[PDB]
Amino acid sequence: GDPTMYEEYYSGLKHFIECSLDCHRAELSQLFYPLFVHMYLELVYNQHENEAKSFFEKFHGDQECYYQDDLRVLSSLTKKEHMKGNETMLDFRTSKFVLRISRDSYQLLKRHLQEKQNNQIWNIVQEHLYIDIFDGMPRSKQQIDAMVGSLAGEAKREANKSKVFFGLLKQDPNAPPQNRIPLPELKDSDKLDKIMNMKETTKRVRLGPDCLPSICFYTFLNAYQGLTAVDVTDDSSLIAGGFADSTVRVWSVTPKKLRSVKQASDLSLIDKESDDVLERIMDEKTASELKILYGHSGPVYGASFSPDRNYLLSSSEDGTVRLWSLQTFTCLVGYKGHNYPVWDTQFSPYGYYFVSGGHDRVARLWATDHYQPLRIFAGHLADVNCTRFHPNSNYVATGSADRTVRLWDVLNGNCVRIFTGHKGPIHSLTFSPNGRFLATGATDGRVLLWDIGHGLMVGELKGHTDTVCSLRFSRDGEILASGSMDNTVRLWDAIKAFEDLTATGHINLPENSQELLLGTYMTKSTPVVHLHFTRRNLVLAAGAYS
Template identity: 25%
Template sequence: MISITSAELNYLVFRYLHESGFTHSAFAFGYEGGINKSAIDGNLVPPGALVRFVQKGIQYLELEADLSSTSGDMDDDFSFLQPLDLITKDPYELQKIIKAKKENMQKDRFEENGKHHNEYNQENEREHAQETEKEKKGREKEQEQDKERIEKDREREKGKDKEKAQQDHFNREKCEDKVITEYEENGTFGGTEPMDISTSSTSLPCDISSCDVTILEGHTSEVFACAWSPSGSLLASGSGDSSARIWTIVDGPSSSSAQNGSANVVVLKHFRGRTNEKSKDVTTLDWSGDGTLLATGSYDGQARIWSRDGELRSTLNKHKGPIFSLKWNKKGDYLLSGSVDKTAIVWDIKTGEWKQQFEFHSGPTLDVDWRNNLSFATCSTDSTINVCKVGENRPIKTFSGHQGEVNAIKWDPTGSLLASCSDDYTAKIWSMKQDKYLHDLKEHIKEIYTIRWSPTGPGTNNPNQQLLLASASFDSTIKLWDVELGRLISSLNGHRDPVYSVAFSPNGEYLASGSMDKCMHIWSVKEAKIVKTYTGNGGIFEVCWNKEGDKVAACFANNIVCVLDFRM
């Protein structure tokens, strides 16, 4: 990988976005020690997207020759934008920002010029002298009214703070009373009271009480991924601190916090030295079907296999770039990985060696998903999807139809339908029986980051419920789709910032969502509204349910993992 400075990389980022009309869903970010640092003015983004952007920037660098030799001609427009603007503003808003700041700069230059400065002051004095006494009084009256409004606002804020403090005190007392009552009546702290679901569309969401939240502390950087083991009460998390952790979550009501030194966590270090190595940040992880092994993928391009006790079983080293996604097949004898090096690799777990490398994409491989124990799908920044099979030297199917990066792919529970989502604002549903998509789902107005199938319909534990697809977008909404008819069922509008993760409960009745607005919502799928909500102190990268459906985990940008009790 070519070595470039942060200034050069930022210029690459700007030039790429500028020349493509600011329409791409990539990110601007800092660069530390040659390794990407996933922080944008305190707002964190998933590592996969960052590495994707680095790769594109380097491709642009190679086409434009040596950037350093032309750095004196850099476009000044970049200096008017903050990195966060490139994520949160559309092209029209960015153009307005640049125009406004240019006008302000011209005004400042005008004022700095001696002659113009005097003319400017003289004009102001003339205008001031021409003001009537009535206008002065009018301004004074407006100032008095402004003071009165400010004072009233302060009084209202004081009242709100007092009311909030009283409510918090009441909630704490209620929480303590509930736990004590349950213990006295049942001899245990385990509560099974049904959740209150409001039937009014105008009712406020129900905040999850602090006594129903366990905060897992110990990571020293943003937590990008989390996943429950399919067996037992183990929760894995992967972080930018170059480590993964396996937490043992006790049954029953949550405790307030679990510190780093507790005996309920095993730390899986991806570095050997005393200090963390940023190149080994954990980007993705996945449990084997029987819950005995955990696979982690890292920026260093290596996949690692761990026992549930934290023992490193094997290191899988063949990729030449960061790993974006890892998936076990159902049988548990193969592990599939996708990387920025444009390839996917199937690993033989028994031998600890690679079985086959698939080099069919012209851009980074963003996501992979098994169809069955031998065949799988891959998607890429090259806008295509390949369906491959172990032992075959060419894709058995290639789907082309997206007009932008394909960010995620998922097979339905039976392996008959494949869903995909893209930067082109659409999700699509494909069948192996035809080349063109079955349905083109177009209701989102910004990039779609991820998708999930409901655990319902034929071949699932909930065969009598309708099969649904959920899509989560940078437009802050989640949409539920009828996959048989290819139409929108409902739009879940409760977040204020991009939604990075969604997950259905095991019974398919609820959907959890996590967003950069720091909120995790739990929605009733049938009623299409929020029934529970939790607000943390950082953006949320991933949410997941345990197999029983009574706990939801969420990982945050402020280095913590939360486990929420959810009693239905």
Template identity: 45%
Template sequence: MLASASSTVSRVGGEKCTYTECKVKQLYTTPDAEEALRKETGFYDEVPQGASDAVWSAYEAQNDPNSYADAYNSLKKFLDDALDIYKEYYYEKDIQKLRTIKKKQQMQGNIFLDTFKANQFTVRLSRDAYSSLKRFLEEKKHNLLLNIIQEHIYLDIYEGLPRTKAQIDATAGAIWGEAQHQANRSKMFYGLAREPDVQQLPWDAFDEDEAALNFQNKRRRELDKAEKVKMYRELGKKVSLSGSRLPSVCFYTVLNSHESERRVVSITLSSDSSLFALGFADGRIQILSIVPQKLRAMKNSEELQTIDKEAADVYARMLDESTASAQKTLYGHSGPVYGASFSLDRTLLLSCSEDGMIRLWSLWTWTALVVYKGHIWPVWDVKFAPHGYYFASCSHDRTARLWVTDSIRPVRIFAGHLSDVDCIEFHPNSNYLATGSSDRGIRVFDCVTGACVRTMTGHKGNPQTLVFSNDGRFLCSGGTDSDLFVWDLAHGHLLARLSGHSATITSISFSMEASILATGSLDGSVRIWDWAKLTGEISTDDVNVTHNPEVQTNSAAILKASFPTKNTSVYLVHFTRRNLLLASGVLEG
């Protein structure tokens, strides 16, 4: 309090300063100290009433709860009397939460309140609205309100007309306010390398000429020839989908897993749609094959010595047929397994757990190869990069991290979120990583520099799943607010907010040609959206950093079908290479 008073009185001089210092001495020190100050300064005369009111009232106001109530009521009356065009509504639901805090003890450990106290809350205001507010504060001499604004609020002023309530609601939501307009000014290179046109490739080219598969992206991890043939043959046979030609859906239900120890907490599918990975609450990971090919383990070292290493099918010869089974179980984690990710060639599996560990498993030996220790709190998600080798993780410690499989230390640490980082997703070109957090914000980080290049706000709940569009231009997100959000990566704007689900959206997937979008939710339904129609209605030609396009909310026109389950929460939706939609979930009760 003395420091606060000193900073206040330092702005005035002469008798006002000395008089106020004497009053502070009266309150917080002995009479001898006050007398010593008077002798040192030679000040014994009382200053006329009102001479130091401005200084002393500013100091007293900081310690008087009634002064805060009076200032708030004055500000509220000013806002109520203002023209509707200048009224910008923010976070009414969050203010209701703050009203429940009545005692000092309730403030301790309140994450929501601690965030407000430790960070400046960003509020975007038009120039006209800011001028009106500034004029009010200066005319009424609300020094207390000015101090609060300067200390706890960052006013992001923009030129142009004030926004409507709908426009504000579209971007409000994060517990730290809105994204600042300068946060999305850096250029983002979201383009992709050109892929070969599989419809134009003769199939004998796969067998005779490797040059026919001349990938332009040098970072792509080379698959063996058999994997390439399989992948492109399936892509060549895919069914074309549209708003009038919807996909077939195949649902896999996990039974007898609702008990506490046997509870399934995560479901993952390999990129070729052949393997499931189920993460259990007791730390187990179960790998299931949904194709006729069984899961086999590698032969022992003595038997491997007898194999002809020059044989074309050397990898098949290395596997022991006597160990073939439809499922395998991996043990190692000491807490619930919240996430898993298959490598592109399905020889490796990453898993993350509440124990704070990330494990790399071999799907040939069915053992853990590496344990990555970097996070100090539970790890919520882990993902391989599209081209392998790199992978990312996110945790309760509010960070996301970038790793390489051959090092036990992270090569990048992405910081900036104010709460748990709950989900992550690599951009298709592997240059960027998107993160969703319990602070209700979404960020996109550059994997090379580690810098945050996009900050997006609008979610009213925690984002739980992220996915980039196939062309890399858009980002879709879903979370506990039950809405599907579509973001423009060029400038970080929200383009669409689609409602329909009644519970948390847990998974999003694009069809192979990106004409259809599928979502799965804890409400037990799979919904199909017409992505081609949505993007066709969005005009991005005149969009820039300061001009946000109108947010599309016409969900009924975009929603094409809904497939409900009887009592199964949907954990995963996934399009196969032939555009069959696979979904999976856990039967409740």
């Protein structure tokens, strides 16, 4: 294990792989990156700083181009105590790189490592690297490039084989057959909402690749406090704005001003019956087109409406999640579980539970009834950037900054799926309305479409240039809309993308990006922060013009 010769062990295996035949060379190039980091981090942990920086400058140049932001965090790490407080490379050193390889290429690898001529790079491989073997064809280089890029990358197939109830509630065999929780205590006012919701569904247009939807951009014009969070209600009636001046601002977009309910003295005199139910309590003295909400001590990063159009949620840098009423327009609860910036929050689509992901590398499940969470989803190695509920709300998808997307079962808090293949931190997730698919976007401009019953990320959409910060499917599921920092709203055919949909863990996905594009829609200097679909299939977007 002499450190003086780590540039002789790694360069010997680098000489074996590049001298191999081209079918096995592209698959054996996967263990360049984890063997470079695990040898570099073991040098700096054993205080070999002088012969660690020479190991870096020799071998960091022959890495893949999508690891460039990963190596510059390693160039700063030269001491041991610098790495003892990083907590991402501390969890990288103790975990195992999974490194899915085929059995046709593993036989050439094990015939070069079981011999005692090498005998130490084989000791590093069987100490720091898992190897998950599949029986099949060796993957191509542009297929290996599609499914790598994460620390602890390309997770095992034994993680993606659990039974996931990805179906919708009310048959659906891949979904809880009889429970079908139709919203905790579905009320008569909540049943009155779905009556006027299906009147909107009557006017809903079938979008497809021919009837392209109209996009109504709701730009924030002045916005000199930086807009950090947008949410729209399920019916296009309210638009929330989270801003960098520690405010949440609700706007009514329908011609109906935002009213608070009357004070407790005015409600006590309201006589029994004589109507007096949901209009007699609304105060007309307080009626604006804009309500500003104060109380966060930091920039508000998450914004989430409840499906009953009360109960705004907001999370911010100060480590609290706040539940604002939309009947009194005050704050109700401050959920203090993180000490760190909560980057996202979202209500359940049935409106009781909510999930919040923060800088402390967990995502908590709350219930609006307890000051403490119910489930802690604590398997990510970096910040939980996104947190999205499944349409049946039994599963929570948490994208993160360690380039992985993970599905979490609400029962038992177990990770049931691990989706790797992004090259940057994931900044947007959305689910298909079927519940069978999941679209994720990240800073590499790639929209990767994942299956949930299988977990193979069947499609890849690579039209965007900068960070894809907003995704949504249509109300029918016909079109996925993507909005990025390129100031473009791209529309993708979300029917021709899933038309085809194992024993090998991949489907050999094509370059269908050009065929799946329906439009690009460049925006005037305005990053598309939110994308929303009206129930009559009209795209809404909100941007904060710069």
